[PDB]
Amino acid sequence: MADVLSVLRQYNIQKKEIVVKGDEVIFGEFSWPKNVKTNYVVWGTGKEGQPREYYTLDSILFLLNNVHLSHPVYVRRAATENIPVVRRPDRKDLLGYLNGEASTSASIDRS
Numbered sequence: 001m002a003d004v005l006s007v008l009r010q011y012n013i014q015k016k017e018i019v020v021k022g023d024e025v026i027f028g029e030f031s032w033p034k035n036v037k038t039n040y041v042v043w044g045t046g047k048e049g050q051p052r053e054y055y056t057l058d059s060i061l062f063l064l065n066n067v068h069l070s071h072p073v074y075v076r077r078a079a080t081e082n083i084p085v086v087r088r089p090d091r092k093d094l095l096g097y098l099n100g101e102a103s104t105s106a107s108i109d110r111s
Contacts, residue, residue, distance in 0.1 A: 001030055003038070003039050003110065004032045004036055004038055004057055005038040005039055005040055005057070005060065005108070007027050007030060008027070008057070008060065008061065008064075008098065009097060009098050009100070011027055012064065012098050012099065012100075013098075013099065013100040016028075018061075020034075020061075023035075025057055025058075025061060032057055033057075034056065034057055034058035034061075035056050035057070035058060036056060036057045037054040037055075037056060038054050038055050038056065038057060038060060039054060039108050039109050039110055040054060040055050040060065040090070040094060040097075040105065040107050040108055041053070041054060041107045041108070041109060042054065042055060042087060042090070043087045043089040043090045043107070044087070044089075052109070055084070055086060055090075055094075056084065058083050058084075059078075059083055059084045059085065059086055060086065060094065060098075062078060062081065062083045063078075063085075063086045063091070063094070063095070064095070064098055067095060071088055071091060090107060093105055093106075093107060094107070
């Protein structure tokens, strides 16, 4: 298996069933907690030697499952659910990666 975000991308591209049970997100045999950190850097972080920060799986999955909402409505929904938001400058790039428009991102740190 690759990293969790790459697995999420694979499942999304194939439209394979993803199971959310409690705080687990399940991809076939594999499971991660909702709060696992992905390798996608949050816009605005990692400047001037300061730490990079990363979106959680929950944050990314919540965006993916709510792509039909306008970004402003999505921001409000995310607040209601207490799930951190994907920042607007990351939205198009992250969704394009998840949908297989791209196979990497300048925001993904992956050795």
